[PDB]
Subunit: 339 residues, 4 copies
């Protein structure tokens, strides 16, 4: 029904990674052959889906765990560069239907900043999408978080280019996987582990002052905010009425509600629940919520038939379906953008 | 306004642990001296609070991390026995105002089952409250989870005595603390880490078939369910439409919604939000929600002035405030129980 | 998906009233030929719909405006008796699928009480359903309301027989139609006028003390309560904080929330909105909400596909779908009643 | 806590109407002596309240029933002119704290249009506020509605001046009072009758095509929309799926949700319910909701302590508290307008 929707948690994989794609599909897809075809296709199947379901524009990004799974920094950087060059050539076929997020090796702040800049300046990419902490160390068992002063040069590049950063999940690996997840492995991914990682990282950015040093920085979370809106009251209470009397105020200058009004966005990817959407509208505001799908892990039909038919006032259907993202990503036009 | 409310996430500490109590208070209280007095008091300050705020009956339990912090199994068991003997003598002063949950060493399923039985049979305790995984191993860096076949003898003791088990959080320790939390330490506790632990453990019980082998087992989570109701739609979708086509059905026979209708309860402890309560009423049902406070980490005033004044239909105010817990814990009477 | 649902705002018309059926259809149906067949059919089409959509049991009632449109008390009484005899015979064909509400002339309290008693004692009808005020006076321009002492004998008959009374709407007529509705006639019926009538009558019963004189009396409103839940806060405030200080307490002894907890029920007839249902669960409580359809003015498909697929906790889906009505109407087994 | 709030359903009365003020107070106030002082005061008591509760700017309007109670068109017009001249002088004392709505006799479309124009062009009034239908006829028993072609000249004046029209309630009178309300008089006013009138009039404007002929017209309803949001689903269904197939489309060209997105506003006057506000954010959108008080029928304390302390995302608190009204009324700076 609604046309010109924008979706922006929409994944692709390189054709040369078919074995890795099938491993990931063995965890998260019930039809591996269709999954392989859909995650690698850019300009045919993906366009047919969007045409049937009123999706005018999609910002594509690399599948998880992606470059964050690569703990060799030279290999990781070369892979990020390869992916960005590849998707730039692919989306030129349909520029009124596709944009792309930069794919990044996050081993080094300046290296990541330079590649983000190359993507934005050379290819017009719309921002960055990163799958939660970079694997590093001898066997990839270390994690690189971005919520510290070493990453200021990177976050300042984001605000200078004025593009958002999408904190996507990745799977638990190594020591963390063995200790917490191996004995309850069906919880890996969307059921629980994904949100635990993203919420930890983003609230780390909050409590380590990233949005104080970079007040213009825009951060996006999928899956209606990875549990965080559920605890908006509880986090705010334990920040303002407890931890900010014990030292947190030294590195965290605004309330959690301020940061959601000024810096943080949430997306409807993989969470097609009108009851939860309404609750998020109360706790974060319809202005800060964007439609997305999580294709091809979710189907266009599930996401779009939900949203198109959800009971919702017309003002917020427009905002969530396209107008919020249209302003955030400075979209002058695209297919059906004002339909 | 409402009298005879029941609260059941209400903590005490032994007087001999003052140093440990002050360490915990240095993380989670803004007034250490009042905290020490309140967490150790049973029959004076705690009764004065309850009298002012319409709380007829409280089920007391041992402060976190409690016995789960003790990785010496002999020491841990002796401490659990000591705590249960102590609180039994304390609550006999005011039997129409206080019951108690068993405090347990969870190093060994049969040992824990026997001590739960002793508490219920000898002292009339109302169930068990355990602070998420037992520390074990050489330096307490291992975790004992209860979502496996070794714990069947324990869960069968719970269903035979027909008493619930409250899965309370504890702090992250050791390797997990260093890897995920040390660099964002203000998130430890109520802001995030507590819910991550409890939700992992309870959903582990779900996906490892604990409620299939023990369909009468009642499990309680505080803090409006430790994020889980937020993802009810998403978990249900990724169980029924994804993982249960890939192997999860082998150890998980009902839907997540079934388990919340039949086995799982949530509590309002430390989450005094009517907007979130309404959302939980939609996602889990008012029948499955219990009032609680989280005293003395939360104040009676915050919890009770919220609940007493919250906009709510009279049917559900009665149920959540006392009648749900009255039926669950088989309370024939207590102060103001039918006021 | 849910089987054994109960619906109880389901209308029929006498075959000999085809012209009245067609006039009403010309206001409220977009397929008059199907409507005529469906509103007169009891045991074939209506059963086929119920079998397809998991409706085990239906309490049937006479179409609006029905006997309340008849201002000749002799003609009105004879028609009520005719209708009750007719539907008693019809429902005997499928007694495990159908019950009936009494149809009443409400010109005289004792006469109406006697015919309700005959319906319950002779035919086992489940209650009464009445289309708002009884037209009266020489030209049918007066209105008989039931919220006064003259009707105590009638309400005492309801409580003695322990059966509920369903306050259904009727169209505005005569002077009221001319002054308020004739110049905006598209608002007649479900869009506005229906709820204005029923809410006036039920809140009249509240404020004139009917539920104080008859504390066991159960009153049912369709259409999620005819706007009243939206104003529960506002009515409660303007009663307890205003009118109850000015004289209302003389004839109204409990709060509006008390009466919804103790006396008033709402159904989902013609209001297939999960967002509004959730709000009603907050304002009135799931224990007080009953599934219903409003057939043949609404379709089985619209009502049942909505309810069966609505995002709802399993506890409340069971209560609203059938268990609330099973208890209220003291129902024996019926088709799929325990499925 | 929030400063610079805007309220715009704030009433005054002329000093020479003490008897009318006292009769109205005898229906709607529990402290008539304070009410008389507060409803006549402009520049002292009312300012003190606003200073204490963070209300920067108020648009003032004449008390109900006001000029709509006057069925002599000559007396009605003279009184409207008197009131507008009076309040223009009063608000000049504190022009950074007060604006005014036009008070109008609505006996004649051209006359009302001319007085609205005088108010805007001579005094800079912000719009019009009218208490539902104009009493008319020899004994005041007729009602003038504005949802017809005779009023096109008036609505065209609203859009030409680009100012909104606030449809405020009035009490039921004459035959309507006798037939519907006299025997249940405690429902008169906020409990029920007020909303019945306004919702009828506004939905009449919808279904008689006023917003089709005048697509720029902005209409404001108090009291969270006078029940209409509760039935948004039901009205929309009975328009688009029923009446629009039977002839309504001839005079009503968009959906009810379109008109709430494009033409209709609601305020929080006299409805200090976060639960209902959240529901209204789902059904109408936070962009279309305005803070207001309904002083002196409601207190500043009730309205502002509710709103300032309600659990709400920061984006919508800002919009509802002041930014929506700042844009709608094109307001220059006022006290704390950017605080
Ligand atoms: Mg994704
Ligand atoms: Mg606790
Ligand atoms: Mg009906
Ligand atoms: Mg007013």
């Amino acid at each position: 029904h609604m046309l010109g929707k924008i979706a922006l948690e929409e994944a692709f994989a390189l054709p040369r990674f078919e074995e890795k794609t099938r491993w990931w599909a063995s965890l998260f897809s019930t039809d591996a052959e269709t999954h392989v075809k859909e995650i690698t296709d850019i300009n045919k199947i993906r366009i047919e889906h969007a045409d049937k379901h009123g999706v005018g524009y999609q910002i594509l990004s690399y599948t998880a765990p992606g470059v964050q799974d690569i703990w060799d920094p030279v290999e990781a950087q070369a892979l990020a560069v390869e992916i960005n060059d590849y998707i730039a050539e692919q989306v030129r076929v349909n520029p009124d239907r596709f944009g792309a997020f930069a794919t990044l090796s996050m081993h080094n702040p300046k290296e990541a900043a330079d590649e983000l800049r190359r993507c934005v300046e050379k290819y017009g990419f719309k921002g960055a999408l990163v799958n939660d902490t970079q694997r590093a160390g001898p066997d990839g068992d270390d994690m690189i978080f971005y919520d510290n002063a070493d990453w200021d040069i990177f976050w300042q590049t984001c605000t200078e280019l004025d593009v958002p950063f999408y904190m996507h999940p990745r799977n638990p690996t190594g020591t963390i996987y063995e200790k917490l997840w191996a004995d309850r492995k069906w919880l890996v991914g969307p059921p629980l582990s994904f949100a635990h990682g993203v919420s930890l990282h983003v609230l780390g950015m909050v409590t380590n002052g990233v949005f104080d040093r970079h007040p213009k920085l825009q951060i996006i979370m999928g899956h209606l905010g990875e549990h965080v809106p559920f605890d908006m009251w509880r986090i705010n209470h334990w920040f303002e009425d407890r931890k900010k009397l014990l030292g947190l105020a030294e590195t965290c200058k605004k309330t959690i509600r301020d940061y959601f009004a000024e810096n943080i966005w949430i997306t409807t990817s993989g969470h097609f629940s009108t009851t939860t959407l309404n609750f998020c509208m109360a706790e974060v505001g319809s202005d800060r919520i964007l439609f997305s799908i999580d294709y091809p892990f979710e189907t266009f039909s599930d996401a779009c038939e939900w949203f198109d038919n959800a009971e919702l006032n017309g003002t917020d259907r427009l905002k969530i379906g396209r107008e919020n993202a249209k302003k955030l990503f400075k979209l002058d036009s695209y297919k059906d953008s004002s339909a």
